[PDB]
C-alpha cells in the first residue's frame, strides 16, 4: 500500500476524449503539486517547474532580484558545477530551455529528446536544491539583465506597463521595478555594502520552498515510471513552509481614482487607456463574470461599442475586459487607438463608453449569452489542438497553483455556473466615480511636467474636472447600441469524414491549370473537424513599384476593415482568416472548423472582387499607414540590421523611405482603378488540408476561381510571368559592409552573413550541422562569457533558395568590435571541432536528426511544412527523411573541409556581408581575433546590386 514520499494521488484528471495522452496528478509529502503526462508517441519530453514567487516579493532595496535569481540558476549547481552543463546537455540532446519571472511566479521549462528525460530532469532538479551562484558568474550575468532592460527601455509597451505601477500607491509592492539592472543589481548594492551572492542565497532559501512549487513532467514512460522519477528527484526539496503572499489592498486607492494622464510616446501612436480597479475574480472562475462582460464590451459585431466609435471616425480598434493584477486585485480595462479626429473627442468617447455600460445595466444579465460562451468553450476544449510539450508543461505548472488537480486541464475552459449577481457586482464597479484615464500622443510633447524614474517617460497628471465626471455619470441610453444577436457561425457539424481509398501521405497536385495549382491532402493524422485552406494569388502588379505596393496594402487593409463586423462572429466560432499583400501578390489563409469555412471564404472572395471603398475610412487607414512606415525608425537595432540585409540581398525590394514618399501620390481614384487592374490577371497556388474530401477541395478551389471570373473578369497569367526573385551572388574572398544609425535606441545592431551555395541536400546538411555544433557554444562564448548582449543569435539563413550562416547581436559595444569577437569565436570553433571526440560528433548528428524528424503535433504545423515546400517552389515533401538519411553520412573531415572552403578567415570562397547599425550616440581574458581585410563600404544599394551576379533559382521536384 502506502508511500512516505507522496501526500496524495488525485482521482481521474478530466481530459478531452480526443486527447490520447494519459495523466496523473499528485502532491508530494513536501507539498509540491505535480502533474504527470504519459505520451508513448512523443518525440521530445518536457518538464517545467513553477514557484509561486516573483518580483512582487523582491527586497525593496534590490529591485529585480528574482529576474536576477532566475538568470543565475542556469549557471551551475553543486551537483553539476560546470557553468553551462545545463545548456550544453540540452543542445546535445535536441532540447532547449527557458524561464520567466512575473509578479508572482517564476516558471522554468525545458524539452529534450525523449531518451534523455532523466538526464535533462536530473540536471534540472538541481536548480531547486543547491545552485552555486558563482561569484564571477554573477558578475558577468548582471550585464545580460542590464541588457534585457536596455532593449525594453525605448519600447512604448514596457514604459506604459511600468508607468501604470508608478502612479498607483508607491507604498504598494505593485509599484516595484521587476526587471532590475546593472545599477540596481550591482552598482547600488555595492554602494550600500550589500553582498549579492548572500542576498541571492537568502532569497532562494527563504522563498524557493517546496510548498510553493508545482512541477509538470511529460515523457514517454508509464505513469508509474514517471511517478517514481519525480518522487526520486523532487522529495529532497526542502519544506520551509512559507505563507503565500497576498495583496488584499488595491494599489489604486481613492487619491488615484478620477485621474488623467497625458503621456508622450516614443512612436507616433495615439491611444486612450481607460481602467477601473476591481477585486480579484479568480475565485469566480466557474462562472467567470469579467469574461462575460469582456465578451460584451470588447465585442466588434453589429450593434457594438466599437461599431459606433468606428462610424464616428474616432477609433480604429478596441480591446476590453479583465486584466490580471495579483492575488487580491484586478483591473477591468477598455483601451482604443485614436484617429486624428478621435484625439479631440476623448471625452465624448468615454461617454459613449459609459452609455454602453449603461445599456448593460438596463438589460440585465443574459443566460443565453452565458450559454453561448459556455458552448464555444466546450467545443474549443474537446477539439483543442494537441500542444508542443514545453509550452504545455510550462502552462500547466502555472495553473497547478489555482485549480484542484482534477480540473487543471479544463479549468480555463469549462464554465459551469450562471451568476447574474456577480455580473451585476462587477458592472457596478465600472463607473466614472472610479475611473482612470490615460492619453498617449505626441501632442503632449513639451507640455508635461513629470518623469518616470525607470524608463524616463514624460507625462502629466490631473484630476478629471467634477462636472466632466457628472456628465459621464449621467449617461442616457443611446440607441446606436445593441447586444449581439445569436452567433450563426457556431459549428454544429463535427464529423470526421472517412479516409478515402486514394488518400496520400503528402499533398497531391490534384489540379494544374493556367488559373491554379491545387495541392491537396485529406488529414490522415489528427482527426479534428478542422481545415486549413491556404492561397497564394500571383500578380506582378502587387509589387511592380512603390506606389503599387502601397496600393496593394491599403486595399487589403480596407477590405479587412470592411469585413471586420461580419468576420468577428466567425472568429469567436473558431473560424479565422489571415490576409495580406506579398511581394508576389496576396496571401489568404482560412483556418478553423470546416463546418462553416465555405461560407466565410465565399464572402471574402465575393468582397475582394466587388469592393466599394468608402472615402472616410480610406483617409484614416492611409494616415495610420504613413505612421507605421515612420514608426519603423523606432524598431530595435537588430531588427533594422535584418531589414537592411533583406533589402541588400534581394533582386527587388522597395525601402520604407521609398514607400513613404510614394504614399502621398495615392488618391482614392488611383486605388479604385488599381483594384480591378490587379485582379484582372492572376494565378492561384493553393494548399487545401484537413477534414475534407478531394472533391470538396476541387469545388472550393473552383468556387474561388468562379467568383473572380464572375466579378472581376479575371484571366490566367502566363508561365514566363510567374517570376521569382533571385539572391545577389557575392564574389569569392569578398567582404562588404553597409552602415546605418539607429536614431531612437542606444544600443547598436549587427548581422553578419557568410553566404554559401544554393540550397541542396548536401549544402543544406553541411550548413545545418555546422549550425548545430556551434549553436550553443556561440551563445555561451558571445553572451555568457563575453557578455556582449542579451540578443545573440546564430544559425542558417535562407532566402530565394540560397543560404548561409548568420550572427545577430544587439550590444552596447561598437560593431567593428562585435565583428572581431565573432571572428575570434569562429576559430575557437574550428580548433574545438578538431579536438572533439567521434562520439561527441555523432551526438550532434543525432541531435540535429531528432530536431528535423520531430513530428507535427497539430494540423497547422503540418500545413506549415507543406506550405514551406510550396512557396519556396521546391515541393520536397519528404525532404525530412531524405535530408536526414544523407546527414547520417557525414564525418568530422567533411565538416572541416566545408568550413575551410566557405567560412574560415582565409577561405577561398568566403562571402561575407555585414550590416552595421550604430547606436544613437556613436559616430564611427579573451581569445585571439584574426586580422581582417579592409571591407568595401556599401555606399549605395542600387549600385552595389547593379555590380553583381544574381544566383539561379532552385529547381522544383
Ligand atoms: C475574454 O474576453 C473577450 O472576449 C475580449 C476580447 C476582445 C476585446 N476587444 C476585442 N476582442 N477581451 C480581451 O481580449 C481582454 N484581454 C485584455 C487583457 C490584457 C492584458 C495585458 C495587457 C493588455 C491587455 C485579455 C487577453 O489578452 O486575453
Ligand atoms: Zn529574462
Curated annotation (Swiss-Prot):
PROSITE patterns: INSULINASE. Zn(2+) binds at residues 67, 71, 148. Substrate binds at residues 295-301, 318-322. The N-terminus is blocked. Its cofactor is Zn(2+). The keyword Oxidoreductase does not apply. Gene3D superfamilies: Metalloenzyme, LuxS/M16 peptidase-like. It is an enzyme of class 3 (hydrolase). The modification N6-succinyllysine is found at residues 151, 656. Changing residue 245 to G: Reduced enzyme activity. GO terms for molecular function: amyloid-beta binding; ATP binding; ATP hydrolysis activity; beta-endorphin binding; endopeptidase activity; identical protein binding; insulin binding; metalloendopeptidase activity. Its EC number is 3.4.24.56. Changing residue 385 to C: Increases catalytic rate towards INS and amyloid. Homodimer. Can also form homotetramers. Plays a role in the cellular breakdown of insulin, APP peptides, IAPP peptides, natriuretic peptides, glucagon, bradykinin, kallidin, and other peptides, and thereby plays a role in intercellular peptide signaling. Substrate binding induces important conformation changes, making it possible to bind and degrade larger substrates, such as insulin. Contributes to the regulation of peptide hormone signaling cascades and regulation of blood glucose homeostasis via its role in the degradation of insulin, glucagon and IAPP. This is Insulin-degrading enzyme. It comes from Homo sapiens (Human).
Amino acid at each position: 500500500m502506502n508511500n512516505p514520499a507522496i501526500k496524495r494521488i488525485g482521482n481521474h484528471i478530466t481530459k478531452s476524449p480526443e486527447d490520447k495522452r494519459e495523466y496523473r496528478g499528485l502532491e508530494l509529502a513536501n507539498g509540491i503539486k505535480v502533474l504527470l503526462i504519459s505520451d508513448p508517441t512523443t518525440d521530445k519530453s518536457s518538464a517545467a517547474l513553477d514557484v509561486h514567487i516573483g518580483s512582487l516579493s523582491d527586497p525593496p532595496n534590490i529591485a529585480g532580484l528574482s529576474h536576477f535569481l532566475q538568470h543565475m540558476l542556469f549557471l551551475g549547481t553543486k551537483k553539476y558545477p560546470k557553468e553551462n552543463e545545463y545548456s550544453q546537455f540540452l543542445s546535445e540532446h535536441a532540447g532547449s530551455s527557458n524561464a520567466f519571472t512575473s509578479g508572482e511566479h517564476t516558471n522554468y521549462y525545458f524539452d529534450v529528446s525523449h531518451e534523455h528525460l532523466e538526464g535533462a530532469l536530473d540536471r534540472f532538479a538541481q536548480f531547486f536544491l543547491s545552485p552555486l551562484f558563482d561569484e564571477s558568474a554573477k558578475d558577468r550575468e548582471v550585464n545580460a539583465v542590464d541588457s534585457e532592460h536596455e532593449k525594453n527601455v525605448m519600447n512604448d509597451a514596457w514604459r506604459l506597463f511600468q508607468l501604470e505601477k508608478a502612479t498607483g500607491n508607491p507604498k504598494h509592492p505593485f509599484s516595484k521595478f521587476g526587471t532590475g539592472n546593472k545599477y540596481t543589481l550591482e552598482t547600488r548594492p555595492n554602494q550600500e555594502g550589500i553582498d549579492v551572492r548572500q542576498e541571492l542565497l537568502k532569497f532562494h532559501s527563504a522563498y524557493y520552498s517546496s510548498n510553493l512549487m508545482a512541477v509538470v513532467v511529460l515523457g514517454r514512460e508509464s505513469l508509474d515510471d514517471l511517478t517514481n522519477l519525480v518522487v526520486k528527484l523532487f522529495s529532497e526539496v526542502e519544506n520551509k513552509n512559507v505563507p503565500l503572499p497576498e495583496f488584499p489592498e488595491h494599489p489604486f486607492q481613492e487619491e488615484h481614482l478620477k485621474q488623467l494622464y497625458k503621456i508622450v510616446p516614443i512612436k507616433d501612436i495615439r491611444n486612450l487607456y481607460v481602467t477601473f480597479p476591481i477585486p480579484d475574480l479568480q475565485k469566480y472562475y466557474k462562472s467567470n463574470p469579467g469574461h462575460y462582460l469582456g465578451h460584451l464590451i470588447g465585442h466588434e459585431g453589429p450593434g457594438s461599442l466599437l461599431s459606433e466609435l468606428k462610424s464616428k471616425g474616432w477609433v480604429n480598434t478596441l480591446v476590453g475586459g479583465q486584466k490580471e493584477g495579483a492575488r487580491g486585485f484586478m483591473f477591468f480595462i477598455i483601451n482604443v487607438d485614436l484617429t486624428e479626429e478621435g484625439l479631440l473627442h476623448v471625452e465624448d468617447i468615454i461617454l459613449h463608453m459609459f452609455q454602453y455600460i449603461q445599456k448593460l445595466r438596463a438589460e440585465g444579465p443574459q443566460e443565453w449569452v452565458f450559454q453561448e460562451l459556455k458552448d464555444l468553450n466546450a467545443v474549443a476544449f474537446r477539439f483543442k489542438d494537441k500542444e508542443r510539450p514545453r509550452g504545455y508543461t510550462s502552462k500547466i505548472a502555472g495553473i497547478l497553483h489555482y485549480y484542484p488537480l482534477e480540473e487543471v486541464l479544463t479549468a480555463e475552459y469549462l464554465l459551469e455556473e450562471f451568476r447574474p449577481d456577480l455580473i451585476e457586482m462587477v458592472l457596478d464597479k465600472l463607473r466614472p466615480e472610479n475611473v482612470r484615464v490615460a492619453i498617449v500622443s505626441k501632442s503632449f510633447e513639451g507640455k508635461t511636467d513629470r518623469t518616470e524614474e525607470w524608463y524616463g517617460t514624460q507625462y502629466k497628471q490631473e484630476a478629471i474636472p467634477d462636472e466632466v465626471i457628472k456628465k459621464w455619470q449621467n449617461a442616457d441610453l443611446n440607441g446606436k447600441f445593441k447586444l449581439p444577436t445569436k452567433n450563426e457561425f457556431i459549428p454544429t457539424n463535427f464529423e470526421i469524414l472517412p479516409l478515402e481509398k486514394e488518400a496520400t501521405p503528402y499533398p497531391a497536385l490534384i489540379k494544374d491549370t493556367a488559373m491554379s495549382k491545387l495541392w491537396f491532402k485529406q488529414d490522415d493524422k489528427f482527426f479534428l473537424p478542422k481545415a486549413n485552406l491556404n492561397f497564394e494569388f500571383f500578380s506582378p502588379f502587387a509589387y511592380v513599384d512603390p506606389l503599387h505596393s502601397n496600393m496593394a496594402y491599403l486595399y487589403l487593409e480596407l477590405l479587412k476593415d470592411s469585413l471586420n463586423e461580419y468576420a468577428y462572429a466567425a472568429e469567436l466560432a473558431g473560424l479565422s482568416y489571415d490576409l495580406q499583400n506579398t511581394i508576389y501578390g496576396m496571401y489568404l489563409s482560412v483556418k478553423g472548423y470546416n463546418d462553416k469555412q465555405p461560407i466565410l471564404l465565399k464572402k471574402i472572395i465575393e468582397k475582394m472582387a466587388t469592393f466599394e471603398i468608402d472615402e472616410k475610412r480610406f483617409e484614416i487607414i492611409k494616415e495610420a499607414y504613413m505612421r507605421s512606415l515612420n514608426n519603423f525608425r523606432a524598431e530595435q537595432p537588430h531588427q533594422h540590421a535584418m531589414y537592411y540585409l533583406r533589402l541588400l540581398m534581394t533582386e527587388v525590394a522597395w525601402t520604407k523611405d521609398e514607400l513613404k514618399e510614394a504614399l502621398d501620390d495615392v488618391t482614392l481614384p488611383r486605388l479604385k482603378a488599381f483594384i480591378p487592374q490587379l485582379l484582372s490577371r492572376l494565378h492561384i497556388e493553393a494548399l487545401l488540408h484537413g477534414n475534407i474530401t478531394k472533391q470538396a477541395a476541387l469545388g472550393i478551389m473552383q468556387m474561388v476561381e468562379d467568383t473572380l471570373i464572375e466579378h472581376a473578369h479575371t484571366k490566367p497569367l502566363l508561365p514566363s510571368q510567374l517570376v521569382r526573385y533571385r539572391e545577389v551572388q557575392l564574389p569569392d574572398r569578398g567582404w562588404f559592409v553597409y552602415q546605418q544609425r539607429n536614431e531612437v535606441h542606444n544600443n547598436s545592431g549587427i548581422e553578419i552573413y557568410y553566404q554559401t551555395d544554393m540550397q541542396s541536400t548536401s549544402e543544406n546538411m553541411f550548413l545545418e550541422l555546422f549550425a548545430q555544433i556551434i549553436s550553443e557554444p556561440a551563445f555561451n562564448t558571445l553572451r555568457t562569457k563575453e557578455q556582449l548582449g542579451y540578443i545573440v543569435f546564430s544559425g542558417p539563413r535562407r532566402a530565394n533558395g540560397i543560404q548561409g550562416l548568420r550572427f545577430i547581436i544587439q550590444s552596447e559595444k561598437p560593431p567593428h568590435y562585435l565583428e572581431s569577437r565573432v571572428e575570434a569565436f569562429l576559430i575557437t570553433m574550428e580548433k574545438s571541432i578538431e579536438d572533439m571526440t567521434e562520439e561527441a560528433f555523432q551526438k550532434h548528428i543525432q541531435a540535429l536528426a531528432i530536431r528535423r524528424l520531430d513530428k507535427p503535433k497539430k494540423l497547422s504545423a503540418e500545413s506549415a511544412k507543406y506550405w514551406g515546400e510550396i512557396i519556396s517552389q521546391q515541393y520536397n515533401f519528404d525532404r525530412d527523411n531524405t535530408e536526414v538519411a544523407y546527414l547520417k553520412t557525414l564525418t568530422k573531415e567533411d565538416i572541416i573541409k566545408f568550413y575551410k572552403e566557405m567560412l574560415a578567415v582565409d577561405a577561398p570562397r568566403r562571402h561575407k556581408v555585414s550590416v552595421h547599425v550604430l547606436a544613437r550616440e556613436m559616430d564611427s581574458n579573451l581569445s585571439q581575433a584574426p586580422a581582417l581585410p579592409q571591407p568595401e563600404v556599401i555606399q549605395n544599394m542600387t549600385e552595389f546590386k547593379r555590380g553583381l551576379p544574381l544566383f539561379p533559382l532552385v529547381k522544383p521536384h
